[PDB]
Structures are given as C-alpha cells and as structure tokens.
Structure 1
Amino acid sequence: MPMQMFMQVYDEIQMFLLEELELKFDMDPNRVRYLRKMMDTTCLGGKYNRGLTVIDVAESLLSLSGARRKRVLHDACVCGWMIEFLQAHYLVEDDIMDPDVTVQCAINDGLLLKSWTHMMAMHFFADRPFLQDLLCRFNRVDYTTAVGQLYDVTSMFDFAEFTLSNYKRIVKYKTAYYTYLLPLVMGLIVSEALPTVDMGVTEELAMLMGEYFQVQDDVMDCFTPPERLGKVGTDIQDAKCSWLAVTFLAKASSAQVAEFKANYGSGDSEKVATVRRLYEEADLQGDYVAYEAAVAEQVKELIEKLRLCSPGFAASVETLWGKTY
C-alpha cells in the first residue's frame, strides 16, 4: 500500500510534467519521450528511503491527531518525490564530476531535475497555505547541501581540518539535513503539525542519525568488498575526511601518522593497502563498535524527549532509525 501509492503518484507527477512541456513549452514527442526515459532512469530504481519517510511521518500524524486524509497522504507522496527528484539531481551532478553532447545533456538533465521539484510543488500545492514555507525550507536545505559539499571537497586543501568536530560539520550539512531532517519536516508540514513538535530535539536527532549512518558508510567504503558494497571504495584515494581517518590521527604515534600522511590520498594499490593496514593495526573497528553504540544510546534518549510532546511523531522516527540501524 505505501509503495503502491508512491509509484502511482509518480505516474501522476510525470504525466503533468510531460504534458506541460508538450502543451505549454512547445515540445515535440521525440524530446518528451527522451525526458520520460531520463526521468525514469535517474529517479526510479533506488530504495526511495527519503521519499518513503515523508509518507511514514504523515501517516502517524493523521491517525494520531474524512476527506482530509486523502489530501495529506497525496501531498506527502508529492513531497516524497520532490526529495527523490532532488537526490536524482545530486546523483547527476556527481556523474559530471567524474562539442561533447552527452556532457551537455547531463548538465542540462541535472538542472531539469532540480526545476521539476519546483514545478511539481507549484502545481499540486498551489492552493496550500504552506506552499511558500515548503519551498523556503526546501531550497534552504538544498543550499545547505551545497555548502556541505564545499566542506567535504576542500577538507584536505586550504590534514589540519581532519578533526572529529569538522567531521560532524561535514556530515551535518552534506548529508544530515537533506537525508534525515528534510523528509521529517516535510511530513510535519503536509500534516500541518509543524508547530506541535520540538524542532530542537528533532534537529538533534537528525544530526545524530546522519552522523551514525555516515560512520557506518565510511567503514563500508573501506572494508566492505566491492561486490558487497554496490560500488568501489574510493575514500582513501580521494583523501576524504572519513571517520576512520580522523579517529586514526587521534590515537596514532608520530611514525604511524607519518606513514599515514605518506600513503593517504594515493591511487597505488599498495599505498591504499598500507592505509588499510594502519586502520586494522590500530583496532579502529573496535572503536567503531563503541562509538556507534554511544550514538545509538543517544538516539534512544532523544526519541523519548520528543514523545512527551509529540508521541505519534516519535513512532515514525523509531521506524526511520530502524532503517539505519
């Protein structure tokens, strides 16, 4: 039922976008079908984690507060596809980083996906009192993610910024705002229960869960084999400010830091294996267990503070926290 409606609203959104291009933007069928295929390729196929969270939050707030039900659930599905389209926009921008027409189309497709989030919001929410507030928080978080990518890209240029606090700054703006806080807030807005929740506890929860997932994501990028990860680990070669790097630099000797700096950020197969050897020989994945258990304990506590004033909202956050844990 949740996924079956989420895909049904996708058909309704796509039909509006493509018909608007044909009827209002004077687009020929060849380019309409091309944009249909590009939309299905970049937006469909994933796990829809962010989009389904919006639907999960809106369900808990209408059942725990009738034509109002159909309106809120449909609005949540549109907001869910706004984030899914925004993630597709981010994925296209990543493909560009790594008279050529296929690059011109990739750049143009990234801008179209970003614009489609505005068009589907201006259309389905034209008669909603929260349209202006929804677009403001949406674009502010998109601005936050771009600022977060600047911290992540320039984390090794200006090892001075390889600290745990700066790691939290990167995860906060690069991941935590649009992956965890944005879907929760969009669920509160379509349910019109935005002023009925403690946003401080909610924001603090999103940062903790965002940081928890990133530490697990950094370890998998290093030790999980390529076939079991769905990609090829590249944080070592890219000299990324990962949780493993900042935790190593804090508990290593001068030679181990010297050997780390002489091997980190290189593409040689044996210099990367030397980095992994330094990670293994420091019992870092022992610190990984305790660090994650400490964060998970902080997640359980903040959910209870949020339930005293918003019970049904915390139930949907326990579901979101389960999909990460």
Structure 2
Amino acid sequence: MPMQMFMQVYDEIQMFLLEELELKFDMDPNRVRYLRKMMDTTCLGGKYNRGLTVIDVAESLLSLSGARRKRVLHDACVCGWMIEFLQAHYLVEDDIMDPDVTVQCAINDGLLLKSWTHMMAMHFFADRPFLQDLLCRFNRVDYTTAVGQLYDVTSMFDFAEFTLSNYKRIVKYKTAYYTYLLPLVMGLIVSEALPTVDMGVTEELAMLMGEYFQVQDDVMDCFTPPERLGKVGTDIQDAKCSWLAVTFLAKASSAQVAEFKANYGSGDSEKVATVRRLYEEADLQGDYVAYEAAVAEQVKELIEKLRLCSPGFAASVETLWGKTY
C-alpha cells in the first residue's frame, strides 16, 4: 500500500506542476511533454527509500501518537517526493560535472528539479501551520549537502585531509543529513511531533547510519565488480577520500605510503590495480567487517535511548536502519 500510495501522489504532483506551467507560466504543449519526460526520467526508477521513509514515520506517529490521518499520510507523500526530487537534482548536478544546448538543458533541469520541491510544497502545504518551518529545515539540509559536496570534491587538494575525522565530516554533510536525517524530520513535521523527540539522539543516529552506508559503498566501489555493482567504481581514479584510503594510510609502512601516493588518483589500469593490491594486502576487507559491526552496535544502542521517550518514532528509525543494515 505505501508504494501504491506514493506513486499515486506522484501522478498528482506531476499534474499540478505541469498544469501550473501550462496555465500560469504560458508553456506550450511541446515543452510540457518535454518536462513530463524529463521528470519521469530523473525522479522515477530508484527505490524511493528516502521518500518511503517519510511515509513510514508518519504512519508510526498516528498509530502510536480520522480525517487527520488521510491528510497526514498525503502530506507525508508530498514530503517524500520533495526529497526524491532533491535527489534527482543532485544527480543531474553530478552528471554535468562528468553553444552546447544539451549541457544548457542539463543545467536547466537541475534548476527546475530543485524549484519543483518548493513549488509542490507551497501548493500542497499552503494552509499548513508548518510550511515555514518545513521550508527552513529543508533549505538548511540542502545547504548542508552542498557544503558536504565541497568537502568531498576538494578533499585531495586545498593527503593531509585523508583522516577518519574528515572522512566523517564528508559523510555527515554530503550523505547522512539529506538521506537519513531529512526523511525522519519531514515525517515528524507533517505529524506535528518534532518537539516530542530528542533531536540530538536523532542526529547522532542519522550520522551513524550514513557512515555505515558510506563505508560499505566505498568498499563495494573498489571490490564489487561492475556487473555486480551496477557501475564502474572509479574512487581510486578520482582520488576520493574514501574509507579504504584513510584506513590504509594509518596502517601502511612508509614505503607503502610512498607507493600509494605515487599511484593514487590515476586512470592508469595498473596504477589502479597497484592500489587494490595494497588495499588487499593490508586486509582492508577484514578491517571493514569489524568497523561496520561496531557502528551497528552504536546504532542499536541509540535507537533504544530514542525509544524511551519516542517509541513510535524509534520503531520507524529501526525500519530505516534495517534497509541499510
């Protein structure tokens, strides 16, 4: 039911946005169909874990606190699509990074996808008392994410920043806040229950889940093959400040560090392979198991602190964690 409800509200949001363009912004049918196709291409096709998480938090807080129900779940669906459209926006922005009208249109797509998050909120939440608080928390997480993208893209310039604490700074802002913290906060908002929860425990939980996810993503990027990973992992070539790189640098001998530094961030096939050889021979996949296991323990423990005062909310934080773990 949640997915069928989420997709039903997608059709409703898309029709509002596109009829708004036609009726209030003078848009011609060719461009409306063009934007409908762009929207479907960029916003549909994933798993919707960010958006479905908003729905789950909302249902938990109404079962464990009926026209208020119908309204809360619909509000939750619109907030879910706000996050999915934000994610679509970041993805387009990444694609541009890696009189040309196609690049012009990609930039425009990125502007439109972000503006659509505002446009759907201003329409569907027009009369809600939380519209202003919703816009502010959404904008702040969006800002946070751009800051984290800056931390990430500039991490190899300014290996001094190849440390675990800076790796965690990148994860926190680039990934954790909009993937884990934002869906949770948005469900609390539509449920009018934000003040009822320990936000420190909640923020701590989102950072930890985001870290668990990113370490795993980093290790798969290097070790999971493309037919199994679904893409070509290029972190070594891109000289990412990845979990593997900062962990290797701490346990490598000095000549190994020199070998790492001479070969990292190159597209050359054997320099990339020399890096994977170093990672393997330093048993980083062994280190990965224990590192994740310990993050998991801290996650489990913190959910219980949350549950003492917010049992319903904690149950949905538990559901979101299961999807990652």
Say whether the fold is shared (TM-score over 0.5). yes
Equivalent residue of 1:308, what SS? helix
Q: CA deviation at 1:241?
A: 0.3
Give 2:298's aligned residue.
298
Give 2:24's aligned residue.
24
Q: CA deviation at 1:283?
A: 0.8
- Identity of paired residues, percent? 100
CA distance in 2, matches of 1:120, 1:230: 32
Equivalent residue of 2:309, what SS? coil
Q: CA deviation at 1:230?
A: 1.1
CA distance in 2, matches of 1:48, 1:229: 19
Matches within 5 A, 1:270-285: 270-285=270-285
TM value normalised by structure 2: 1.00
TM value normalised by structure 1: 1.00
CA distance in 2, matches of 1:307, 1:151: 33
CA distance in 2, matches of 1:300, 1:19: 46
After superposition, the C-alpha distances for 1:60-89 in whole angstroms (9 at most, x for unaligned) are 000101100000000000000000000000
CA distance in 1, matches of 2:56, 2:276: 39
CA distance in 2, matches of 1:189, 1:316: 14
Give 1:69's aligned residue.
69
CA distance in 2, matches of 1:41, 1:3: 18
Q: CA deviation at 1:5?
A: 0.5
Equivalent residue of 2:56, what SS? helix
After superposition, the C-alpha distances for 1:217-250 in whole angstroms (9 at most, x for unaligned) are 0000000000111111000000000000000000
CA distance in 2, matches of 1:283, 1:96: 36
RMSD: 0.4
After superposition, the C-alpha distances for 1:118-165 in whole angstroms (9 at most, x for unaligned) are 000000000000000000000100000000000001101010000000
Equivalent residue of 1:240, what SS? coil
Give 1:107's aligned residue.
107
CA distance in 1, matches of 2:17, 2:240: 38
Unmatched tracts of structure 2, length 5 or more: none
After superposition, the C-alpha distances for 1:248-268 in whole angstroms (9 at most, x for unaligned) are 000010011010001100100
CA distance in 1, matches of 2:323, 2:21: 37
Q: CA deviation at 1:53?
A: 0.4
After superposition, the C-alpha distances for 1:245-302 in whole angstroms (9 at most, x for unaligned) are 0000000100110100011001000000000000000011111111000000000000
Q: CA deviation at 1:169?
A: 0.2
CA distance in 1, matches of 2:243, 2:214: 8
Matched length: 325
Q: CA deviation at 1:108?
A: 0.3
CA distance in 2, matches of 1:109, 1:83: 16
CA distance in 1, matches of 2:65, 2:150: 41
Give 2:240's aligned residue.
240
Equivalent residue of 1:265, what SS? coil
